[PDB]
Design a protein around this nucleic acid. Structure first.
Ligand SMILES: [Zn+2]
Ligand SMILES: [Zn+2]
Ligand SMILES: [Zn+2]
Ligand SMILES: [Zn+2]
Ligand SMILES: [Zn+2]
Lengths: 101, 83, 878, 64, 254, 38, 117
RNA sequence: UCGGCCGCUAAGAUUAGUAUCUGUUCUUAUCAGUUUAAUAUCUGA
């Protein structure tokens, strides 16, 4: 391949993903596409994290875990939790949850 | 090309024969609307009753077209082209 | 859908009022700007009744108004500063009864812009020049003269721009026949924008600056500038040229100061404060408006404070200079937008809100305070407010400004509905009942204690339940406690005891003297049950200090049966700016004794202001901040049964139809929510594609919502067909991670089908028939006291005719203050599907030759055009 | 024209322009001013004077 | 006679080669006078065939003439034939059709509202075209269409076309980018400053100076055009540590 | 074979994806390096 | 002094909009906030593509433009039929929503109120 | 992933801009600076 094309495609630059067991992707185009490819997906399955657009451009393992921790708490704080959040009355106006009811 | 853009006064802009009908902003022959006002400095002396566009002898009044009026391009300043 | 807008009752609020001989005769008239309407008033000097001679819609925002008379002139002209980037001079033609536009000079773009002039307008006292200014940077001076035909002429504008400079106020200075001068209160912001310590901002001084217009050299020079000790809020032109000393008074917080260019020392007098005032001790005082009365012999100014007290201000001059400023308390009237002294001995007070008053000046004006009297640090002048003495009330012009809430209903059993109108403001608030009829609408007013926010009609008794709330206000219990401690501090600091006992017995009515301003974040609120027939209070609940009621609903709960409950949503310790709140409460009352008495049940705490409460399916929806909760009744509390947490900002209103809930956001407009009964879920299924600052909403049909916004617009949003509202939440909660929706909101979008800018803020919208056997209209009421309708065309033929009439009138009869009509109606969004019948009815007011020209274009005759215009008016609303 | 920006406009400059335009718009639109006078329970004149006073440093001091 | 005017039409087609603009301008008007006399059918057929020429002076004057014929005789008589000529696989013909539409929507003004939905699919084709001139001329149509139908509820078609005009804001070719900016100024009036601001927001603080330069030139034109309207439309920016960015008065409730 | 006329009336190579004003431009292209490599 | 993409995604309410080049902005917090705003429209994807905006559309034998059905049934491919085409038979085309930008590869009681009688 | 380098448009006027083929496209050890969104480019070690 001519050297001008190697530099245009940025194959000179080398990018690492730890979710891929330190697999190096040459060029930005190859690296920005892998986050949807198989190797990254498999690495995210191993961590137990769904491979969403949230975790694109996230290469380190410790960051992907902490971001997944943040997201899971965010979505749980978004959603209606009728098992703990619904209010019931037993007798004489004592406020209780659905389990206690 | 560069328009004077100075605060326009009471003086009315003129067009020569060849530029008659043209909007001074967009160079359209279509739908004259608002009458053109020019600044005092573009009107004073030998520049009295000269064409807003080219600078030849004025014969008719300059107008902004309806499109320039809707866009409020008539509010931008003295539209005499000085270059 | 195509609507036609008509005004039923024009805005009654007054923004500006000027005085002069507009007819040319010795009779004095008053030109008043309601915001979008210019109106000529003539008080009869014999009767003391104000007659409206002319009202015109100017389809713009009037931002300033001044009267000028050329030297040796006999007729006053009107100069208008507006939101069109044009200065307009008008002359009233008494024979034709119309305002003729004499001159219209264009200088900039339209809108209420920061740097394009229009906000401030000043005229040289001898009529030789007018200055129009922006809040920032730009000032233009137009030379005014007359030609050989004695017709007014206007020059090209001379500019007087300075970068980075804010203008607080401008007046012409009465210099006699010397070169015209304009005094400005200015502040340079340049050093503030460049200092990250914030120290320059704190050390920035307001300056008084005098721009002189050299008539010889044809340029404006900034001749003198001087910093001020404290920031002035406005200037008063002082009489000059041998009818006074010239110079200006600067009104600032706590002080009135006289300054003149030259060797005049500055003279400063403290503003006198009410003795034993219950207002928060920290607050100072500003004059809100001034009037000058120049008799040939003498001059005085009347200036009103923000508590409504008018002071007569006289300048004592010795050989063309001033030595002292003297202040005498004159009378207390409601806080005025404008006060105007008519030479016939009458004073017209255009209230800031509510009814306007014409008083007769019985006596021309107790201790006389003065700038020459010594005063120590902390010490001030003290006067005692007392009932009217120098003024006699002769006429009272009714105004609905501000309309805060409205219900159109037949509560009186008249078959024709009445309009129940919650009018502001403060202790001058009222519930007004409006009937179509002659005594266009006749009113009856019932007083209220605080600004009414909302009311609801109890279905079984037709009693109103009104919540009234004011910020900066004491409850009755707090005001009593404050009065007892002030009487105790009076004695502590035998004669004092007699003064304390007098003070506790002195009860100055709040409707007249104003309510005591408590501080920031202090609220007073009441829940009032009122009979709408004669407006007697059946029940009044005073809430605790610093609880502010913002929402109210009357409803039955399914679990409890037939009993009616009232729910009031209250905020606890709300600070408006910066916004913070200490939670809130929903109070629940049972409404008993045939809807007369409120019996307290319980108070349920909530985390945010419960700003909207809507009965829903035998339970209630409550919007608590940005959370939409379903609540059921319970025994000790309302019980939370369902929640949606996906609403963007803050819930300003909720409307329910079937299982759809339309939620108003404060800024992100309309969100459609489906309630699933079986799943017990609230799911957002659709939203809008524009920010709207929603004030009010009305459902027109099952898919269509009409909304109004803070900015004066009305919109109608509709769900497109095959909008599916049956969408469910993922039980696992995995789809929430994948689905991102559309444009960072709901996957389905509503379509805006109508946009129109009314020009005034609309706080109520209701779909109703106004006249029996008539057709349904969307009625709206504005905060300027204006009532309008939007009515649908039924025919293409009729829509096409009025569209053509509007097209011709937009060109043939363009708005008086130089604005483009289509631009003004498209102020925030492009107008869409509304014809303005306020413009189309100006056809009747046109000159007959212009009526003939337009009608020929329409291929009709002027009587036939007028008939069509009347036919649509009468179908929907008289 | 004051309030235009360019590729180096910062958050603070953009927001100070918006706040200054907003306060001038409120001073210009009568009903918007009415709404704030009623909400705050202040005179319209007091409201206007308070807006004029915020025009100097609406967003707090510059970053640098 | 009908044949006499048709012979004149052929002679007028040659007078579009004239050096003086006053002749060409007078020739263009005469084509509309004959169209009013005879009918637009056969005079337009003559004009559409004169779009196959190589001279740019002669072919632009035909596009003016076609639009005059569509102004004299209502555009519904002219448009079906102009839409068909767009199907001809030639560059100057397809550019000629677009150029005729540009002048057509500029001449008819408010009558545009009846012909927006018809032309919209044709303008999408052109805006999707690789050719820069197809995109440049269709942007001029959108500009004149937009200003013509302002106040007549045709935002749905114009916002649709904004989706095909907006990706050309990164074009560097001066006449192309000037046509795009002119389209955007037109759509600011017709669809509103709120919409245009919504297209700007993401690019104002974008990392590349390629995206900010452009987005600020657009935003500045909206700002200067609509300064007061934007007050309602600015997005909420949250307070930072040092600075207060919330407009709290707009959050007050009554 | 790879010679096609576009909807604009110009000519394209399908193999190389190169635009040609005329037939002569395409025939010079077929002699060229880009076409021979493809 | 720049955030990492990892560090910015922790600090923002919408980690998914965050892109690789966003950390190189002069204000990444404001940028991601504006990218998360309701009804804001993404920058055209080709701002960083080497090839110009539509230049990559080549080697396609796209068919001649299909006229709308109401113009097609006129028989242009009668002046009252030509009037009925635009004023009777004219149907609104399939339009696209706010913010749906075109890119190179994209192509390939229930009674209403205020209705006319 | 296809840049960089050496016929058409403006109702132009009676000159300004811009697509497209051809040909050429620098192998780098390891880092740094200048730069840019990134890369490249340029300059050192
Ligand atoms: Zn990976
Ligand atoms: Zn000039
Ligand atoms: Zn023009
Ligand atoms: Zn000329
Ligand atoms: Zn090839």
């Amino acid at each position: 391949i001519p050297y001008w094309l190697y530099k245009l495609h940025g194959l000179n630059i080398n990018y690492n993903c730890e979710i891929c067991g330190n697999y190096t992707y040459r060029g930005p185009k190859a690296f920005q596409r892998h986050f949807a490819e198989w190797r990254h997906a498999h690495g995210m399955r191993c961590l137990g994290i769904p491979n969403t657009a949230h975790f694109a451009n996230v290469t380190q393992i410790e960051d992907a875990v902490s971001l997944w921790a943040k997201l899971k708490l965010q979505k749980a704080s978004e959603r209606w939790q009728p098992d703990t959040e619904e209010e019931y009355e037993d007798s004489s106006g004592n406020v209780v949850n659905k389990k206690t009811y | 090309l560069i328009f004077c853009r100075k605060q326009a006064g009471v003086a009315i802009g003129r067009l020569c024969e060849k530029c008659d009908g043209k909007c001074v902003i967009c160079d359209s022959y279509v739908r004259p609307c608002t009458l053109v006002r020019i600044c005092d400095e573009c009107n004073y002396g030998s520049y009295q009753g000269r064409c807003v566009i080219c600078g030849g002898p004025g014969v008719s009044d300059a107008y902004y077209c309806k499109e320039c009026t809707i866009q409020e391009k008539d509010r931008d300043g003295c539209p005499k082209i000085v270059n | 859908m195509f609507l036609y807008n008509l005004t039923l009752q024009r805005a009654t609020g007054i923004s500006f009022a000027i005085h002069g001989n507009f007819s040319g005769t010795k009779q004095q008239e008053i030109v008043v700007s309601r915001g979008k309407i210019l109106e000529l008033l003539r008080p009869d000097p014999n009767t003391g009744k104000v007659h409206t001679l002319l009202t015109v819609e100017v389809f713009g925002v009037i931002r300033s108004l001044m009267a000028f008379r050329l030297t040796g002139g006999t007729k006053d002209y009107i100069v208008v500063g507006s939101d069109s980037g044009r200065i307009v001079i008008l002359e009233y033609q008494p024979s034709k009864n119309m305002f003729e536009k004499i001159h219209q000079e264009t200088f900039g773009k339209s809108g209420c812009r920061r740097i394009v002039p229009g906000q401030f307008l000043a005229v040289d006292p001898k009529g030789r020049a007018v200055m129009i200014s922006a809040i920032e940077k730009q000032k233009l001076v137009y030379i005014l003269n007359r030609d050989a035909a004695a017709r007014l002429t206007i020059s090209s504008p001379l500019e007087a721009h300075k970068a980075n400079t804010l203008v607080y106020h401008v007046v012409g200075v009465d210099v006699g026949f010397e070169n015209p001068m304009f005094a400005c209160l200015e502040m340079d912001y340049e050093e503030a924008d460049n200092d990250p310590t914030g120290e320059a901002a704190a050390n920035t001084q307001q300056t008084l600056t005098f721009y002189e217009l050299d008539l010889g050299l044809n340029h404006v020079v900034r001749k003198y500038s001087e910093p001020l000790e404290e920031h002035g809020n406005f200037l008063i032109t002082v009489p000059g040229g041998s009818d006074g000393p010239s110079g200006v008074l600067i009104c600032s917080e706590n002080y009135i100061t006289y300054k003149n260019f030259g060797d005049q020392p500055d003279i400063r007098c403290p503003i006198p404060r009410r003795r034993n005032d219950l207002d928060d001790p920290e607050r100072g005082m500003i004059f809100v408006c001034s009037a000058t009365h120049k008799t040939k012999s003498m001059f005085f100014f009347l200036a009103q404070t923000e508590q409504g007290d008018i002071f007569k201000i006289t300048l004592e001059t010795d050989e063309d200079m001033v030595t002292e400023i003297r202040l005498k308390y004159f009378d207390t009237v409601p806080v005025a937008a404008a006060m105007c002294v008519l030479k016939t001995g009458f004073l017209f007070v255009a209230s800031e809100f509510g009814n306007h008053y014409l008083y007769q000046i019985a006596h021309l004006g107790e201790p006389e305070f003065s700038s020459a009297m010594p005063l120590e640090e902390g010490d001030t002048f003290f006067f005692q407010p007392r009932p009217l003495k120098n003024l006699v009330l002769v006429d009272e012009l009714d105004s609905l400004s501000p309309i805060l809430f409205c219900q159109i209903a037949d509560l009186a059993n008249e078959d024709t509905p009445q309009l129940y109108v919650a009018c502001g403001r403060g202790p001058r608030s009222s519930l007004r009942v409006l009937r179509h009829g002659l005594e266009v609408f006749n009113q009856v007013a019932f007083p209220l204690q605080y600004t009414p926010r909302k009311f609801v009609i109890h279905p079984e008794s037709n009693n109103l339940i009104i919540i009234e709330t004011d910020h900066n206000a004491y409850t009755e219990a707090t005001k009593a406690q404050r009065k007892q401690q002030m009487a105790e501090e009076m004695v502590e600091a035998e004669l004092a005891a007699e003064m304390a006992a007098a003070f506790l017995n002195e009860n100055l009515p709040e409707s007249i003297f104003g309510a005591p301003k408590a501080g920031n974040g202090q609220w007073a609120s009441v829940i009032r049950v009122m009979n709408p027939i004669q407006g007697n209070t059946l029940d009044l609940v005073q809430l605790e200090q610093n609880e502010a009621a913002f929402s109210v609903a009357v409803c039955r709960f399914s679990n409890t049966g037939e009993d009616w409950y009232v729910l009031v949503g209250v905020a606890k310790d709300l600070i408006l700016n910066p916004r913070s709140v200490a939670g809130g409460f929903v109070y629940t009352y049972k409404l008993v004794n045939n809807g007369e008495k409120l019996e307290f049940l319980h108070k349920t705490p909530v985390e945010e202001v419960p700003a909207a409460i809507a009965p829903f399916q035998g339970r209630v929806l409550i919007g608590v901040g940005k959370l939409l909760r379903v609540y059921d009744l319970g025994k000790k509390k309302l019980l939370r049964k369902c929640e949606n947490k996906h609403i963007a900002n803050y819930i300003s209103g909720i409307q329910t139809i079937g299982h759809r809930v339309i939620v108003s956001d404060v800024q992100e407009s309309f969100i459609w929510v489906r309630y699933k009964r079986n799943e017990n879920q609230l799911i957002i299924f659709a939203d809008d594609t524009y920010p709207r600052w929603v004030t009010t909403a009305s459902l027109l049909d099952y898919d269509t919502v009409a909304g109004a916004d803070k900015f004066g617009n009305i919109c109608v949003v509709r769900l497109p067909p095959n909008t599916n509202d049956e969408v469910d939440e993922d039980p696992t909660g995995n789809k929430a991670l994948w689905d991102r929706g559309l444009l960072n909101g709901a996957s389905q979008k509503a379509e805006v089908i109508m946009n129109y800018h009314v020009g005034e803020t609309v706080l109520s919208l209701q779909k109703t028939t106004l006249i029996p056997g008539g057709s349904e209209s969307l009625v709206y009421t504005t905060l300027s006291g204006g009532i309008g309708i939007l009515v649908p065309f039924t025919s293409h033929e009729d829509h096409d005719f009025f569209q053509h009439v509007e097209m011709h009138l937009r060109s043939e009869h363009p708005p008086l203050c130089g604005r483009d009509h289509l631009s003004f109606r498209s102020y925030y969004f492009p107008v869409k599907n509304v014809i303005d019948g306020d413009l189309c009815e100006q056809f009747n007011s046109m000159e007959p030759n212009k009526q003939k020209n337009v009608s020929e274009e329409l291929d009709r005759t002027p009587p036939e055009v007028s008939k069509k215009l009347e036919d649509i008016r009468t179908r929907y609303a008289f | 024209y004051i309030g235009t920006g360019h590729a180096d406009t910062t958050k603070w400059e953009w927001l100070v322009n918006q706040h200054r335009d907003s306060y001038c718009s409120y001073m210009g639109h009568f009903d918007l001013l009415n709404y704030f006078a009623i909400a705050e329970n202040e005179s319209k004149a007091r409201v206007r004077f308070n807006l004029m006073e915020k025009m100097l440093q609406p967003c707090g001091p510059p970053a640098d | 006679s009908a044949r006499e005017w048709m012979r004149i039409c052929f002679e007028l087609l040659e007078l579009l080669k004239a050096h003086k603009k006053a002749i060409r301008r007078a020739t263009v008007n005469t084509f509309g006078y004959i169209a009013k006399a005879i009918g637009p059918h056969d005079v337009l057929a003559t004009l559409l065939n004169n779009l196959k020429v190589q001279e740019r002076q002669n072919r632009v004057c035909t596009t003016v003439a076609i639009a005059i014929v569509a102004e004299t005789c209502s555009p519904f008589t002219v448009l079906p034939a102009l839409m068909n000529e767009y199907r001809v696989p030639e560059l100057n013909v397809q550019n000629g059709v677009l150029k005729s539409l540009s002048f057509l929507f500029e001449y008819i003004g408010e009558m545009g509202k009846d012909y927006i939905y018809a032309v919209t699919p044709l303008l999408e084709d052109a805006l999707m075209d690789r050719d820069l001139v197809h995109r440049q001329t269709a942007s001029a149509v959108v500009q004149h269409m937009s200003l013509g139908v302002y106040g007549f509820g045709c935002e749905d078609s114009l916002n649709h076309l904004l989706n095909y005009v907006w990706p050309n804001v990164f074009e560097t070719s001066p006449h192309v980018i000037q046509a795009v900016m002119g389209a955007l100024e037109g759509l600011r009036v017709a669809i509103g400053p709120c919409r245009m601001l919504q297209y700007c927001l993401q690019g104002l603080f974008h990392p590349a100076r390629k995206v900010r330069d452009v987005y600020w030139k657009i935003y500045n034109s909206i700002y200067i055009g609509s300064q007061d309207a934007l007050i309602a439309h600015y997005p909420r920016i949250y307070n930072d540590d040092k600075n207060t960015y919330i407009r709290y008065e707009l959050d007050y409730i009554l | 074979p790879y010679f096609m006329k576009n909807h604009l009336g110009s000519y394209e190579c399908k193999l190389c994806l190169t635009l040609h004003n005329n037939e002569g431009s395409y025939l010079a292209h077929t002699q060229g390096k880009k076409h021979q490599t493809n | 002094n720049r955030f990492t993409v990892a560090e910015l995604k922790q600090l923002v309410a919408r980690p998914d909009v965050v892109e690789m080049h966003d950390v190189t902005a002069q204000d990444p917090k404001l940028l991601v906030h504006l990218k998360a705003t309701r009804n804001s429209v993404p920058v055209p994807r080709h701002w960083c593509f080497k090839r110009k905006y539509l230049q990559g559309k080549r080697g396609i034998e796209k068919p001649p433009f299909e006229l709308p059905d109401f113009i097609k049934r006129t028989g242009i491919q009668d002046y009252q039929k030509l009037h009925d085409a635009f004023f009777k038979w004219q149907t609104k085309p399939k339009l696209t929503i706010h913010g749906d930008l075109y890119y190179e590869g994209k192509e390939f009681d229930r009674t209403p109120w205020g209705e006319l009688e």
